[PDB]
Design a protein around this ligand. Structure first.
Ligand SMILES: COC(=O)c1ccc(-c2cc(=O)c3ccccc3o2)cc1
Ligand SMILES: [Zn+2]
Lengths: 47, 161
């Protein structure tokens, strides 16, 4: 596992082409996230 | 140490998590290749993940980050899709859940778009799809995502395609 950039705790990937995309984020220590909800689902075939 | 508590669909907390799932679906530039073709989900179950040791491990680190960033943890709720969700809920996030080849280096990746995390449920690029039908767009097989509390603290802003 890499490290955060110096002076930072995470990385934000800001979308710069696809206007509809929301952000993605990266942390470099497992202790920086807690898996709070387990969601069980199916994707739905569009009509 | 982990116990899973089922939320009732009548519970406001089920409803607000479902709404975050559904409302952050978008189309993907792969036309559905990795994650399937869909505009919404059928939510089958929402469980609260309770583990005292993992939670305390999280809040300890959250305070350290906060104290390094003017008392601001910069905490978000974000999605995570992984073939390893069962290990994660029992043992926590660690180096074995890192995306070694990811665009921001070897770390653990999360998304605001539920549909982005859905692309990773069966592996990177959707792997070979569902284990039973080998379909990345399976409409039958049950999938699982995590909706996670994440401390970002001071986040490095990467502008990116
Ligand atoms: C083989 O590497 C993995 O174990 C692994 C698991 C999950 C992911 C994953 C999970 C995500 O939810 C995700 C969200 C935004 C951007 C990238 C993302 O990638 C990546 C790699
Ligand atoms: Zn299937």
């Amino acid at each position: 596992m890499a490290h955060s950039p110096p002076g930072h705790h995470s990385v934000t990937g800001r979308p710069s082409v696809n206007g509809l995309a929301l952000a993605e984020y990266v942390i470099y220590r497992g202790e920086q996230a807690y898996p709070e909800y387990l969601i069980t689902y199916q994707i739905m075939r569009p009509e | 140490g982990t116990i899973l508590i089922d939320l009732s669909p009548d519970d406001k907390e089920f409803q607000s998590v479902e709404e975050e799932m559904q409302s952050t679906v978008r189309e993907h530039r792969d036309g559905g290749h990795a994650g399937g073709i869909f505009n919404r989900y059928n939510i089958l179950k929402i469980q609260k993940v309770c583990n005292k040791k993992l939670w305390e491990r999280y809040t300890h680190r959250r305070k350290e980050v906060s104290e390094e960033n003017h008392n601001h943890a910069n905490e978000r709720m974000l999605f995570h899709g992984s073939p390893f969700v069962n290990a994660i809920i029992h043992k926590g996030f660690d180096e074995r859940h890192a995306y070694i080849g990811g665009m921001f280096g070897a770390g653990i990746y999360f998304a605001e778009n539920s549909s982005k995390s859905n692309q990773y449920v069966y592996g990177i690029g959707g792997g070979t799809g569902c284990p039973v039908h080998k379909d990345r767009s399976c409409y039958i097989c049950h999938r699982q995502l995590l909706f996670c509390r994440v401390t970002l603290g001071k986040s490095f802003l990467q502008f990116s395609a």
